[PDB]
């Protein structure tokens, strides 16, 4: 200390404060990830049949589910930088607009989808048609700071 917390509260300032820096680095990462995740989605929806027989890259969908599941909770931690019980609920409760209600429904679906097992080809359809399907919305939820699409 005193980093240790003045470094996590620093993460929770940077990801939350719209600036030239948030815009520059964060939105390069969202486009890079969406292209990776969608090329991987075309592969993954065939790897799901390879998972009946053989070895497969399908494990990396659980890795990116842990990224996106963590990335949802990381916003709840930037509710207020130290607020990690308080606004951890309080901003989730605030998340009332249409995409935010869908994002809440899809994050609990995404955990249930891991939790049923990597089969049920519904884990597969939800990885696709839930956890890619949310990401196309973020193009319009685009946090690149113009008052976007309105």
Swiss-Prot record:
Resulting phenotype, residue 12 to C: In LQT1; uncertain significance
Region named Interaction with KCNE3: 139-147
Effect of residue 144 to H: In JLNS1; minor changes of wt current (homomultimers); positive voltage shift of the channel activation (heteromultimers)
Effect of residue 87 to R: In LQT1; uncertain significance
Extracellular side: 44-54, 120-127
Stated consequence of mutating residue 142 to G: In LQT1; uncertain significance
Intervals, Cytoplasmic compartment: 78-93
Transmembrane spans: 22-43, 55-77, 94-119, 128-143
Effect of residue 45 to A: In LQT1; uncertain significance
Binding, a 1,2-diacyl-sn-glycero-3-phospho-(1D-myo-inositol-4,5-bisphosphate): 145
Domain text: Each channel subunit contains six transmembrane segments (S1-S6) with S1-S4 forming one voltage sensing domain (VSD) and S5-S6 contributing to form one quarter of an interlocking pore-forming domain (PD).
Membership in a protein family: Belongs to the potassium channel family. KQT (TC 1.A.1.15) subfamily. Kv7.1/KCNQ1 sub-subfamily.
Record: disease: Long QT syndrome 1: A heart disorder characterized by a prolonged QT interval on the ECG and polymorphic ventricular arrhythmias. They cause syncope and sudden death in response to exercise or emotional stress, and can present with a sentinel event of sudden cardiac death in infancy. Jervell and Lange-Nielsen syndrome 1: An autosomal recessive disorder characterized by congenital deafness, prolongation of the QT interval, syncopal attacks due to ventricular arrhythmias, and a high risk of sudden death.
Name used for this protein in its record: Potassium voltage-gated channel subfamily KQT member 1
Organism of origin: Homo sapiens (Human)
Lineage: Eukaryota, Metazoa, Chordata, Craniata, Vertebrata
Shown stretch of the complete protein: 100 to 249 of 676
